[PDB]
């Protein structure tokens, strides 16, 4: 089984930043549909991960769920942080995103930002109350995930 044509098109348009198509297809019913062919990302996951600000904004204004989790337990804030998208992260936080949320492996947005070397994101999450002592299932904190080269992020976290 696959998604409907309409849901496929909405998910694709979100990933693409095609806001006009998102506008045509986004309803209360479809705004939080899931990509059952992939990792069950919602339109907001795709827009957040691919840094599609106009679409992120539209989706949030039309009831997109900042708490929706994909197949691995990621919320859209995880996607924004993993890929270093500062404005998207701020928009998600402004619309109610919780910074201390964790995926199925207990990775938080801050673990993602730290591991990926995204300095500004880490600062933002901290500036917004993220807990730097949260361990994932490996027993690792975000600090533990910082590459040795990244002495500034280390400094930032501890």
């Amino acid at each position: 089984m696959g998604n409907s044509e309409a849901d496929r098109q909405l998910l694709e348009a979100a990933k693409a930043g095609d806001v006009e198509t998102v506008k045509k297809l986004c309803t209360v019913q479809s705004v939080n549909c899931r990509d059952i062919e992939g990792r069950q990302s919602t339109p907001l996951h795709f827009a957040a991960g691919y840094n599609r600000v106009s679409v992120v904004e539209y989706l949030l204004q039309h009831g997109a769920d900042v708490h929706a989790k994909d197949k691995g337990g990621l919320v859209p804030l995880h996607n924004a942080c993993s890929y270093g998208h500062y404005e998207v992260a701020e928009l998600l936080v402004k619309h109610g995103a919780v910074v201390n949320v964790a995926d199925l492996w207990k990775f938080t947005p801050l673990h993602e930002a730290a591991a990926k070397g995204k300095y500004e994101i880490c600062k933002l999450l901290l500036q917004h109350g993220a807990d730097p002592t949260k361990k994932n299932r490996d027993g690792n904190t975000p600090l533990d995930l910082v590459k040795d080269g990244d002495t500034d992020i280390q400094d930032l976290l501890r």
Binding site: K15, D35, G38, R39, S41, H45, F46, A48, G49, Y50, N51, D70, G72, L74, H78, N79, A80, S82, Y83, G84, H85, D103, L104, W105, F107, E112, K116
Partner: peptide, 12 residues
């Protein structure tokens, strides 16, 4: 097995 989120770092 843990995989990456949908997305990418750079628009270009």
């Amino acid at each position: 097995q843990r995989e990456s989120p949908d997305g990418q770092s750079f628009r270009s």
